[PDB]
Structures are given as structure tokens and as C-alpha cells.
Amino acid sequence: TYKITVRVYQTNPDAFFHPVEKTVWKYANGGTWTITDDQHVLTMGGSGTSGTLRFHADNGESFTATFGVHNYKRWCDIVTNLAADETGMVINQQYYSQKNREEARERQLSNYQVKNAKGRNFQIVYTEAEGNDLHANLIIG
Amino acid sequence: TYKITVRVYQTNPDAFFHPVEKTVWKYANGGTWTITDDQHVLTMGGSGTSGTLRFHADNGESFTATFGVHNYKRWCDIVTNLAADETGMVINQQYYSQKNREEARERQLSNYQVKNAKGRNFQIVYTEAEGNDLHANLIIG
């Protein structure tokens, strides 16, 4: 089993985001998104799968944060330029079908940040980046 | 906009189910799963899409409950006995690709029930079953 526990930090009062979708890809016997003490916990049956959280703000901004394990190491990716028909479940599957997304996954990043077109920053940093009990902060700018 | 507000009733203390995935299909400008007073609220951009809740019990039982609107009428379906690689995102997309699931959506049911292999009943009943502000009970036996 691999677990990734995510703590969400919102740093900027000009917006407020909230989770609107939580998906789990089908490889490695799947897994679950659960909540313990205000943290989102992705539990997966083995290496090679992942799960996507999609966040939406009142003002229309949105992004996906995807977390998983590839070849026994954590990975993550943030997508901020979501097409009109790119829900979380669409994005999560693309990591196993679209080359650019497959490459983002296979980089096994333990830290990544990117901005949206409005200039807001989003960051995922794993503070426990090793082993089977992984911990990451999702930090919204 | 269509909204489906879901209340989960668990009637049988021999198991405890809890939500482990919530997905939104990409048609009709997608939508969101939010929570208001322990109710799961699926808000959709218009008719023609849907969203899936997956529930797991710590005893191994699991099922998906999918809610949506097809040609302006609500629909619903429950799938039980899920395989390890049938996560909620896999099931949700099946309503637009797999024949028996497409037919289930086309039925535009205001209520549906089914049992799993163990004999446990699962039912969806829309208590507000018309118009744009729909309400359903998901009742686990």
C-alpha cells in the first residue's frame, strides 16, 4: 500500500478554493480518497496509480492537483489551464494516455509549482517524500 | 444549471460505508461535487452530464451511485460487486460508452434499486424528481 496525505494551505484572501472532485485511477488495484483531520488522504493498492483533486474558486479559477506513485517514488502535477470539458476524471486518465502528461508523471517530482493565466501560483511540496507514507502540502497563492 | 442534492441513509449497522471518490463527467461544461450539511451536491452546467459517488465499507463491500440529467430528465444507476480496477471514474465514463450503462442512463429513472452478492439492498429515490433542483435519497440496506 502507498498513502499520500495532503494538507491544503490557502494563503491569499482574494479568493477561496474548494475541492469539487476527487478521482482515483484504476491501476494497482485502485485506491480511495478519504479525509482525516481536514487532510485529504489518497490510499493506493500499490505503485503505478494516482488520484486527482480538482479545486474551484467562486471567481471561476480552477486547477487540478494530481498525486501518485510511479516506479516506487512519489509524483505530482498541477494543471491550471483546464479546457471546458476537462474535469478531474478526464485529467487523471490523461496521465496514462497523453504523452505530455505521461512525461509529467514519470518525472516523479516531489515538488512542483506553476501559475495560472491570471498569475496565481499553486505549489505541491512533499514534506515526507520517501517511503510508503507520503505527506504533501498543496499551497495556493 | 441542474443540481442534484443527495442524502445518504445507512439503515444497517452491520456495515459502515463511506465515500471514497466523487467524479464529474465532462459533458455540458462539467460540474462540481460540493458538500452542504452532510449532503452531497452535484451541480452541473446543463442537461447531459452526471457524476458518480463511490462508497466502500471496511468489510470489503463497495458500490457506485451515479446521478445525472439526460434530455432534461433525471437519471440514476447503482453498480455493486465492483472489481479492483472499477474505480468511480471508470464507472462514470461507462455511462457514455458501454451499452448496458448507456441504456440505464436513457431510462431516466427517478428511482432504482439493486442488491449486491451478499444480499444488501441499495436504492436511489428522487424526492424532488422534476425541474432543475433535484433531490435524492441514497438508502443503504
CA angle A90, B100, B90 (to 5 degrees): 25
Phi, psi of A104 (to 5 degrees): -60, -45
CA–CA distance, B30 with A93 (Å, rounded to integer): 16
Interface contact flag, A93 B88, Cβ < 8 Å: no
Q: In whole angstroms, give the CA distance from residue A73 to residue B123.
A: 41
| Torsion-angle region of B105 (φ positive above 0: left; ψ -120 to 50: alpha; else: beta) | alpha
Q: B22 and chain A: CB distance < 8 Å anywhere?
A: yes
> Which residues are within 8 A (CB) of A90 and not within 5 positions of it... i.e. 6 or more apart?
B26
Contact assessment for residue A20 and residue B34, using Cβ atoms and an 8 Å cutoff: yes
Inter-chain residue contact B25 with A93, CB threshold 8 Å = no
Cell triple for residue B105? 442512463
Half-sphere exposure of B119 (CA within 13 A, CB side): 2
- From A73, A95, A126, select the one nearest A26 (Cα to Cα): A95
* Phi, psi values for residue B118, rounded to 5°: -80, -15
Min Cα separation A21/chain B (Å): 5
Handedness of CA A90, B44, B109, B117 (dihedral sign): positive
- Interface contact B41, partner A, CB < 8 A: no
Q: Which of B80, B55, B20, B42 is nearest to A51 (CA)?
A: B20
Nearest-Å Rg of the Cα atoms of chain B is 14
Distance, in Å, from the CA atom of B62 to the CA atom of A7, rounded to the nearest integer, reads 27
CA distance B35 to chain A (A): 9
Rounded distance between C-alpha atoms, residue B98 and residue B39, angstroms: 29
Contact B23 A21 (CB under 8 A): yes
Taking an 8 Å cut-off on Cβ atoms, the answer to whether B89 and A25 are in contact is yes
With H, G, I as helix, E, B as strand and everything else as coil, classify residue B68: strand
| Residue B41 DSSP class | E
Closest CA to B24 of B36, B16, B32: B32
Put simply, the chain A residues between 79 and 108 with a CB less than 8 A from any chain B CB are 84-90, 92-93
Count helices and strands (H / E) in chain B: 2, 10
Count, residues in chain A: 141
CA gap B116, B63 in Å, rounded: 8
The alpha carbon of residue B111 is apart from the nearest alpha carbon of chain A, in Å, by 24
CATH topology classification for B1-141: Mutm (Fpg) Protein; Chain: A, domain 2 (2.60.270)
Which of A24, A34, A86 is closest, CB to CB, to B89?
Answer: A24
Extents of the domains making up chain B: 1-141
How far is B44 from B65, CA to CA, in rounded Å? 16
**Residue B7 and residue B1 in contact, taking contact as beta carbons nearer than 8 Å:** no
Q: Under an 8 A CB cutoff, do B22 and A22 touch?
A: yes
Do A21 and B78 form a contact (C-beta atoms < 8 A)? Answer: no
For cell 485506491, name the residue. Answer: A31
In the structure grid, which three cell numbers stand for residue B23, read together? 467524479
Closest CA to B27 of B2, B51, B42, B48: B48
CB neighbours of B85 closer than 8 A, spacing ≥ 6?
A26, A27, A29, A30
Number of other residues whose CB lies within 10 A of the CB of residue B38: 7
Residue A45: exposure state from Cβ atoms within 10 A (0-12, 13-18, ≥19): middle
Distance CA B110, CA B128 (A): 9
Coil, strand or helix at A78: strand
User: Is some CB atom of chain A closer than 8 A to the CB atom of B68?
Assistant: no
Strand partners, A11: none
Asked whether B8 and B136 are in contact (CB, 8 A), the reply is no
CB contact under 8 A, B20 and A32: yes
Q: In what side-by-side order are the strands of the sheet with B31-36?
A: B31-36, B39-44, B2-10, B133-140, B121-128, B111-115
CA–CA distances in Å: residue A115 to residues A78, A81, B110: 9, 9, 43
How many whole angstroms from its chain centre is CA A30?
16
Beta-sheet pairing, A121-128 with B17-24: unpaired
List CB contacts of A89: < 8 A, sequence separation 6 or more: A21, A23, A52, B23, B24, B25, B26, B89, B92, B93
C-alpha cell at A11: 494563503
* Whether A123 contacts A66, CB under 8 Å: no
CB B78 within 8 A of CB B63: yes
Question: Phi and psi (nearest 5°) for B47?
Answer: -65, 150
Is residue A129 classed exposed, middle or buried when 0-12, 13-18 and 19+ CB atoms within 10 A define those classes?
A: middle
Residues 44-63, chain B, touching A (beta carbon < 8 A): 51, 56
* Beta strands at A50-57 and A39-44: parallel, antiparallel or unpaired: unpaired
Residue B45 φ/ψ, nearest 5 degrees: -65, -25
Rounded distance, CA B32 to CA B45, Å? Answer: 9
